[PDB]
Design a protein around this ligand. Structure first.
Ligand SMILES: CC(C)(COP(=O)(O)O)[C@@H](O)C(=O)NCCC(=O)NCCSC(=O)[C@]1(C)CCC[C@@]2(C)[C@@H]3[C@@H]4C[C@@H]5C[C@]3(C[C@]5(C)O4)[C@H](O)C[C@@H]21
Ligand SMILES: [Mn+2]
Ligand SMILES: [Mn+2]
Ligand SMILES: [Mn+2]
Ligand SMILES: [Mn+2]
Ligand SMILES: [Mn+2]
Ligand SMILES: [Mn+2]
Ligand SMILES: [Mn+2]
Lengths: 356, 356
């Protein structure tokens, strides 16, 4: 009966089961990501490897219908009061754990074409993330430039890059130049790329959810400390689904090492790590009240709200109730920044009509 | 009050070069930490392994005369306007990378004996951290109890425990119980238990200072998610030298897993992860402005200042210039909580007339 319009910096689409089977040549078509949900488990096959074997809860973790039917998804946007929404891959994310650059490149093209033709075509409120090869810089630059020509506003990078392709390495430089030139936002989504750590013991569910942060913090440390962002002032990076309050914490950690350990520090930066973070690093959250304190108390203005539809850790179907609780008693300019404006700085959707 | 009088939750004592040479059984003597100073490098040997190599400029920058001479240390405390100070090991920290429980147990006993008898005895302004075995719970419990009887107020644990001895494991339960029974604070100091040189490419120095956070965040997640803090309401944990504003960020991350991933969460907790963190998890910093933000906007009141005397990361010798600028225009109550009062909740030193 009373809702506030929001924009969302994070959600996922479920690709068609046969997306890659139907579109790839026979040398490639059997090796592309395949999800099986059977007998209370999700199994993912990539290029002859079991990359996931996760329990499901057939009772208490049932997927929203709109995950399975894109017309129910658009009703859910209106019901939740979300206008614009960034859309990341689901099965497509598994291209980041591929070792074959050819399988990666061709699976990425297929995904970027399907997403635009068949999904983004449903509404210009949908802002797609184009995948680019995590394995090969020439392949990555080619696909970013092709995606830019198709109208994509952001590329997805996995939080854990392949071995020897850390984000501080020179191998990425041409992608940073190409992203800056095209004005593409680089969106680094957590929980993607090779597994780094899996908790097995007591508290595993909570520990595993924390462990997915460390690749995101490391990626920010790598981009800032390496001068990648310093050399590319127009390059903006969105850390998707990692929360926000650690970002000013990391700025202060990097400034302390930069100033106190300066005799070990190479390269030199034109400005402090914390200044590059506050200028170019954005982060999304779903429920975290601390994201608001980062803005009001830590001069970190690059916070974006995200629904993370249709994941358990997102807000659905209580988006409006969550955002009411979050912003009870908060300056409406801060609500406007976090829920609408940062989104429209990074992304272009059609004009949100006014309500009076 | 020409000075702002502070308590320091973090500093280090450099052990006598011959501490272990003289005190250990003959069979163990050669295996204890020892160093060679040649070319312009200090090399540290532990039990048949090179654990650390440093240029002498960096090695000796951490060794102003107060780092060695405890009489000069007390003068430097007065000069810096610091009253109470927690003192952590330097060479003793290498017990956390030993693989032999007997060698670790005996080296720890030698350290704890020297520290109380020859260092802590000069002033009640000094609060020592007793080491306890990282390798064997019975050894760790016996030494915590012995150290308590000697009047120790805190024990040091390494941030990266040995493989299979993660902090969520049942093996630690007897130690949590002994620490709670004795009123002993558990102090986890970052950059211990593991090699700190992880990154070697561009931005390496800044990246490595960030990587030391990941074991600290993992440790808090393990202690919260396992129920170790929930089962021991009297147990307080100090995370030393990791900064502060990531702690409330982690509180929110764990609350989101707890609530949205509840069907996968074991054990259940008597209160939310964020309530355990705000009740029992303390954290120190030297320079970080975001630490004040965590208190004023994220309801995280467990923030302690530390000089980290005499490390480069710390404020020495500009302690008054740093804390004056940090707390310029800050609520005196908040300045008092962070610089004085959390210190005296954890640790007992003679009370200043806060008359001033
Ligand atoms: C520049 C590189 C990347 C080398 O690159 P290249 O191979 O030349 O490409 C590398 O040398 C570097 O990162 N240098 C900065 C100095 C440093 O080692 N940073 C580690 C992270 S900071 C750290 O680990 C603290 C927590 C803070 C500084 C003091 C620290 C190293 C102390 C020092 C040294 C040693 C280790 C120790 C206890 C000890 C007895 O005093 C703690 O375990 C840990 C601690
Ligand atoms: Mn997401
Ligand atoms: Mn998600
Ligand atoms: Mn949910
Ligand atoms: Mn000698
Ligand atoms: Mn320290
Ligand atoms: Mn230090
Ligand atoms: Mn310093």
């Amino acid at each position: 009966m009373e809702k506030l319009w929001l924009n969302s910096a994070d959600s996922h689409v479920l690709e068609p089961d046969d997306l890659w089977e139907r579109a790839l040549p026979a040398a490639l078509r059997d090796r592309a990501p395949r999800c099986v949900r059977d007998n209370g488990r999700e199994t993912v096959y990539v290029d002859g490897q079991v990359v996931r074997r996760d329990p499901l809860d057939f009772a208490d973790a049932m997927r929203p219908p709109g995950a399975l039917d894109h017309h129910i998804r658009l009703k859910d946007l209106d019901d939740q009061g979300i206008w614009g929404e960034v859309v990341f891959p689901s099965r497509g994310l598994w291209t980041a754990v591929m070792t074959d650059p050819v399988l990666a490149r061709e699976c990425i093209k297929v995904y970027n074409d399907w997403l635009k033709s068949d999904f983004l075509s449903l509404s210009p409120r949908l802002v797609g993330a184009a995948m680019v090869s995590m394995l090969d810089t020439d392949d990555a630059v080619a696909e970013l430039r092709r995606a830019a020509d198709l109208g994509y506003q952001t590329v997805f990078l996995a939080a854990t890059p392949p071995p020897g392709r850390e984000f501080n390495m020179d191998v990425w430089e041409p992608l940073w130049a190409a992203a800056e030139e095209a004005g593409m936002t680089v969106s680094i989504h957590i929980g993607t790329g090779a597994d780094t750590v899996v908790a097995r013991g007591p508290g595993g569910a909570v520990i595993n959810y924390v462990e997915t942060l460390f690749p995101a913090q490391r990626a920010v440390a790598q981009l800032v400390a390496s001068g990648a962002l310093d050399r590319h002032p127009g390059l903006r990076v969105l850390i998707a689904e990692a929360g926000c309050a650690w970002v000013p914490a990391l700025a202060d950690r990097m400034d302390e090492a930069y100033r106190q350990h300066g005799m070990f520090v190479r390269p030199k930066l034109s400005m402090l790590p914390g200044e590059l973070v506050r200028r170019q690093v954005y982060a999304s959250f779903q429920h975290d009240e601390t994201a608001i304190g980062a803005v009001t108390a830590m001069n970190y203005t690059n916070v974006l709200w995200g629904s993370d539809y249709p994941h358990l850790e997102g807000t659905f179907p209580r988006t409006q109730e969550v955002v009411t609780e979050l912003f009870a008693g908060v300056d409406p300019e801060v609500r406007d920044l976090i829920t609408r404006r940062n989104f429209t700085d990074l992304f272009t959707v059609p004009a949100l009509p006014a309500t009076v």
